[PDB]
Target: t-complex protein 1 subunit beta
Amino acid sequence: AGADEERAETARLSSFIGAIAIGDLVKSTLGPKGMDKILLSSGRDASLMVTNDGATILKNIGVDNPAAKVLVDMSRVQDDEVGDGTTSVTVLAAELLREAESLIAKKIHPQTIIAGWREATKAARQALLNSAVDHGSDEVKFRQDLMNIAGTTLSSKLLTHHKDHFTKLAVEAVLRLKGSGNLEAIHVIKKLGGSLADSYLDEGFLLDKKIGVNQPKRIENAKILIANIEHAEKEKMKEKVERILKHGINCFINRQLIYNYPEQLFGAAGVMAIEHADFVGVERLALVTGGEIASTFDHPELVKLGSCKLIEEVMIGEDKLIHFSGVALGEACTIVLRGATQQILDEAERSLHDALCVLAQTVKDSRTVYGGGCSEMLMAHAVTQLASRTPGKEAVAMESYAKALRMLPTIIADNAGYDSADLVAQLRAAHSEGKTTAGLDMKEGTIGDMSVLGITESFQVKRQVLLSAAEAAEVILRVDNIIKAAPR
Amino acid sequence: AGADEERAETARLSSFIGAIAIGDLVKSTLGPKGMDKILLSSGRDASLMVTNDGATILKNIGVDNPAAKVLVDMSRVQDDEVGDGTTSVTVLAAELLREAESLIAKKIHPQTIIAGWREATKAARQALLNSAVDHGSDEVKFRQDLMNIAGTTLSSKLLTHHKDHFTKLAVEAVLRLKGSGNLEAIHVIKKLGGSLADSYLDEGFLLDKKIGVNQPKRIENAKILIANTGMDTDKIKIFGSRVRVDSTAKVAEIEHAEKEKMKEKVERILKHGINCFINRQLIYNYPEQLFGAAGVMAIEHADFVGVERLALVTGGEIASTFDHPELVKLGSCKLIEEVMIGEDKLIHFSGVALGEACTIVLRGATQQILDEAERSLHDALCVLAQTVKDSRTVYGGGCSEMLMAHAVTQLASRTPGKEAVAMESYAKALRMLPTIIADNAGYDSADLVAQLRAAHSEGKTTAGLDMKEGTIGDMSVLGITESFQVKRQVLLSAAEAAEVILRVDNIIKAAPR
Amino acid sequence: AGADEERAETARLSSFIGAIAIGDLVKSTLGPKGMDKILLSSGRDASLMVTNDGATILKNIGVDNPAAKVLVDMSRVQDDEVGDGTTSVTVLAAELLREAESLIAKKIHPQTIIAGWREATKAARQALLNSAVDHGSDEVKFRQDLMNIAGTTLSSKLLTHHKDHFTKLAVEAVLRLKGSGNLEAIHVIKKLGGSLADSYLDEGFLLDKKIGVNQPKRIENAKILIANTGMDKMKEKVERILKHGINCFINRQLIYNYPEQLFGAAGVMAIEHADFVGVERLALVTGGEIASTFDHPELVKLGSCKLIEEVMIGEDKLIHFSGVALGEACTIVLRGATQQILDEAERSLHDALCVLAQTVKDSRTVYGGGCSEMLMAHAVTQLASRTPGKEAVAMESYAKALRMLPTIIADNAGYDSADLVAQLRAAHSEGKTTAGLDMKEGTIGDMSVLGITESFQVKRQVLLSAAEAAEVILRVDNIIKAAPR
Amino acid sequence: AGADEERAETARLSSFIGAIAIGDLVKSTLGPKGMDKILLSSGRDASLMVTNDGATILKNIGVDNPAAKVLVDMSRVQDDEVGDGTTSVTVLAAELLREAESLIAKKIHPQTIIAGWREATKAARQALLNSAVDHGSDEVKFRQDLMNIAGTTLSSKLLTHHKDHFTKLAVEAVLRLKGSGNLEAIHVIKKLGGSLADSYLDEGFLLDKKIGVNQPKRIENAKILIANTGMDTDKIKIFGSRVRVDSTAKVAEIEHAEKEKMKEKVERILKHGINCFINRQLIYNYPEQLFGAAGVMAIEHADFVGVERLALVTGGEIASTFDHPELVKLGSCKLIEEVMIGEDKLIHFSGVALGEACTIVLRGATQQILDEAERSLHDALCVLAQTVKDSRTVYGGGCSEMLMAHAVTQLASRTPGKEAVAMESYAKALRMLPTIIADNAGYDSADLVAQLRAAHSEGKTTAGLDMKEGTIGDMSVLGITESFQVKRQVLLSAAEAAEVILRVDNIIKAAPR
Model:
């Protein structure tokens, strides 16, 4: 018999070990004091990637022979419906495995124990019916629009002091982006500087390049041009200007290298040109400006369409950047974030991305549950009764699944800056009482009414995680006759 | 000549160790709650090969120095007559070796113990034409088409939580396939996503490739072109040099030649009404612009295995140089289209006039467990083809094995000297199988042995090992049956294979390399 | 992904060691007795670079595996806003790590302590707004212009013999600079010549080139031509040239020899291979021009006429562009004995140039010499006991961090630091804002009389930077770098 | 390596060690239950050779420094005269060295003992004409063709279950081979598919090659063409340089010349009706297209040994340049087809007018054991031809050996001791064969030797060792007899082979080793 064939302690052990390694990096990731991690791999890579977004980093690397890559793969499917909030789904699945060592002690066919997954099914649907849910989300909405879930996504981030304001801003972006238009060209970049808003909302696309030191500082009623013996050269210079002056051209964007002679002309003319502009920015721009047909210098007049509300290069603080705004279409937009400048700040890139996808499905699902772990504690109180009442080893299955839910309250609290045991202690009493609105308040250090906060979780997050968490655990109970394995 | 010299007992030890190692990995697999395990090999494979079928996994890799690969090789010949169901045959041979320690204490000649192997042929009587087996297999059959044996083969396999449905599907595939044709062009692939059914049973042949973004979405009344030689043209055997030509107007001569190559492809193609072009290799860029405007869909670097299968299905192609079109090419016309299965974009060839060959498509939840379907798929194809045309089956769950065991113990004493001891050791070899079935179950093996024997001795052949139950039950209610053929060949298989292990050192042939 | 992984107690230690190593090198660089440090590297380094200014040397090199480069990187953003004065911000951030040993003694959760940083948010108020004052820096100002902060800024620098005079000069530059809105046109170079003044203030831009050992010395009502393309034909250049009255030609590249004979007879001074960077500033200065082919003259070119001449300075002969109409851009020229200490001036100026531009805009400053530093410590001690407690242990620890600064300033000076710290606190608690550490005295004295003051901006930004940067350290692992192994 | 450091008596030891090493390996080979051995070597070999025939493996390899190959080399001359049957002669020679230890304490002139070999001719002239004999074998013969000695040759080999049937087949092969025509063109190969018969008789020659994917599947009324020179054209007597052409304009002239080679082959081909072309070497690509359209099957790189044999079979041909077709070549037109032996593909040439040369194809149930058939077949082919030609035989199963042993023991003692001691040592040497026959039989050796001697001493020549019985039985009833020639020349040759052993040490083959 060839190859390494493992199922029993052998499969379970490897599954066990894969889950424990992932949980330690991820646990610090969740909540207000969530920690940013940068990964550098020695060999076959040359830089450190900053991602404290659990979904993004896990997808990127297939580090070991032990099983975990497939478990990792299913999270992204989750991340398109809701996906986000905080990365808690992976952590819960991992701890479920730890009780399995206890299971070897009971030394029997563990498949009967598989009933825990059945238990997961009732518990999953139970949280889909029991408690209070939002009835709002009218469309546009005066202020139930945000200050809610994005804030919870933001809760996972330290930057959430001035930032909670920024989170509010993201819904304005979604309100403009809904209906017939698809969830297309959305661009966000953080910047160096300090103001009350700590962010500006553009009515257009944001780019980072400059023609040269010479040229007009900014342009208004702007026109945009996008392009795919020495005396003879001058003819190229003049044709450009002759076509240029009549239009009133204010800005030129070129995907590739730009010839030096025209640069001189642009400065005097009052026209801003961009050398080697990135192609991806351009495609988003075409949808935004109304598009144009890009070919040879014949491109001018009406083959070119150009929006003109306002194009300017503005110092936001440290580094100069160029702002395109006021697109007539409204389908494609850009949001500019600001911060104190840290890896923790790059964390915000995750948060907003997390926020845009969630609202798209918030209107479509018309269903939500309370955030801050309110949903999770309530399920736990109900499941505890269930374990003892049922007969057999089935009860063992049911009891272990129930205690898994305990960690979410603990994980949010641990990164809070407050002691988890007391938190776990106080939290359970409130939820048991039958008070659904009450949950974990990171800001107050204890428990409070999150309805006021407005924090809510989208309906899709609870149903996909609970059913799919099974892969981590199914491997555990296929059989447990305990023989070999190759631990790590 | 060439060291590694072993004889008698020294030879037995290398042999003895190989048999014990194989049994523990394979033991887990047998029965309704069997085992599926993930294989990593590193350096030359770089992926997870989790295999349920003992036969499939054993053939793929020759892991170590001790001899066992040859014993493994023999199982496939058994498979190419049926040798599947649930893997049990390898285990019987392994336990044969344990009695050998007993044999040294015997103090007789060890090589007429070997004559015991002819006894194994005699043992064939116990499992052959002994006990009623099955009825049915009318042809096309309304309800006996499946939900029987495939389900049991699958029962030992984990995938059966959703795969038991897949198993039912496979006989539909055999009904279309069976006839004087024999067994060709059955193409089956696994998909990285899907629905509850987890399989879609396509009308014809399924391939996954696209010409490029520019080109028409569908073609109908389709013509198919297959070429041995690529579209690419230039260098030949001898470059003649990397060239620049002596002036301005001769550069044009080389450029012009490329245009002709374009011209031949369009002129021949348009008359035929060419809907799709499939080439097993690199495709030259110039023709690609042409195909888009024409309304023709081409496939770059199509796999040769897919192409040959397609040729049988379409009606064949004579694959030569650009003269290849019109009648040297036989094109079947129905529909060729690129469709999305439910996730990834694939191209479907269907509506084949021949009808001889068909394609099965599988879908899943994206895990190690999903790749399980790929291996189990191979396992399923073998069971169903044989079950319908052999018109014979035996009760599963080890029911057949215990009944045989009761009769064999009696036989050894009955014979006189030399014949008696050899045959008895073979007889006890049947006893481990009941134990192996129960052990993977998660239920107590010792309890199982005494209760099991009592039901078989009594005469009720239906009773067997019920893993779901944890005790002994009625096998027939389950619908668990084993192909008749697996038992007939295994008895012959075990006899020749078991003593291979008793004579060992390092056995021959592979085919000259 | 692989990497090197450290967490909670072990990760903190690596952070701990990086902070302590930096503080010892930087501590010697504070106040009138600051020590000059010299460094050498091989590969992309050409020669020994010696920098008093902590920010300049730290930015240049990421020497080893331990984490510290990002903390270091941050100080420069502060520098554009102000940064300098004396390097102390790095020291305060470093010492806050010492209380971490105390945190293990706490034995619970390091995150809760982090609340003190919020308490610091309350700060940047009580430090300077309240407690210590400076009422002045009204605008331009007759005598508070200098003989103040620059002297302290240069105190850390050994140059301060002749150099303190140089420092006085720097505030004159700010006065012209203030009004329009922002800094982006100041150029500073050092010369190999020597004089008591040790510096000349140029009303325009300074460049170091000559046409050749021929051509007129002086041009009048000068017109300036800048060309993108090289001169590498004779008649076209002269015909266009004569009509303009062309006094000087500057080309950013190789120049062709035939033209050169013509320029001398005409009475036109040309510059060969003038650096592009100098030219770009000149364009803003002179109104700019479009530097095209030989169609360049007349209208596409703009020229500023005042005085362009070659004048010897000390030893070397330099060419002076001056009298710019715009007024936005100005050039500072420094001269000295000619030693690594002289190069120290290059390090030293990027410590005073930035401060002054900011001094007019803030309209606020604080007394220097650590006067602000001890007073803030007295105020913060009260805060720890008043806040109920979680925010208190953390807050008290921050307060004691301020105690080291008085000690570091004294240590540099050549006096017993504890005695110094001791005498210092009594004067600050008294209510006299002006009183501070007088290193020359060896005791405490009136900071205002010898003039030292610190920009308001340095203290308010540092509080935000030192604190927030320090907390990222406890949670952050690996830090951006190559890290093979 | 310089000085061996062995002295006079120890010189004897090197001979002594060589004899003991060889006897154990050959020991399993003898008698109805024998073991098959596989050898693996690195250094100018290939992949594992398996030899049941002791003579074949010993002859092929010069493994080590001690003397033995010269003894070994001798067995082949025996093989031409008779050879095979079972390998026993090597075993007896090795045994005689064991008594030499007894001889050292026998403070007696060792060379006198040599006279034993002088009287070893007594075994030579006494075994001959005083025991058994065969007098039949008329020619072809209805039942004496086999089911005799070949079965005995096979008996030494375990395969005797399915295999004894195969041995019977071999005589059919010898009968067709007999007449005034010569010993030419015999070829045997095995197939990996199971059948009870395990063999098929092919009327013609078997080869395994094909023209390509295109071409008619089979041909009928076939004409065969063999070429001494390759289809490839360019080199000629004078190369014309290794050039090509300075552009692609002038490339056309060279290409045109190629077409003429294509034309000559078709013109000559069509008139003849040519159905198959066989060439021993590389085949040029251009003609390949021609053959497919014409309907002619050609073979690329055909092996020369098969070809030469084929020529005798087809009536032959004169192979030279392309002038070679029509009358210069003679072809046999019965049937040439590529047929699948239910498994691995191969091509069959059949219906030869000459009848002089024929080929045997064997099929295997599934094991190492049927490569054994290659091993076994060689033994069966040679033995039967000898039985008819010699017109003499002796009883098998060791019947001959015990009788002679009884006769030898009396002569030594009753003659003068100088000639007596030598003779007596020789006598007990014959004793081991009875022991080895029983040893591989399955019964205790001690009991067997004892019961054996009493029956032979009494006077029944027919009685011998019945391995199936485990005791002594009537040899004649089982039909086992040994060719008279195997006994006749072994006694003479063994006597002169053993003599070279005691006196001479170091000896071996060629240098580099």
Observations:
- Chain C has three domains: 1-133+364-485, 134-202+328-363, 203-327.
- The first strand of chain C starts at residue 38 and ends at 39.
- Chains C and B do not touch (no CB pair under 8 Å).
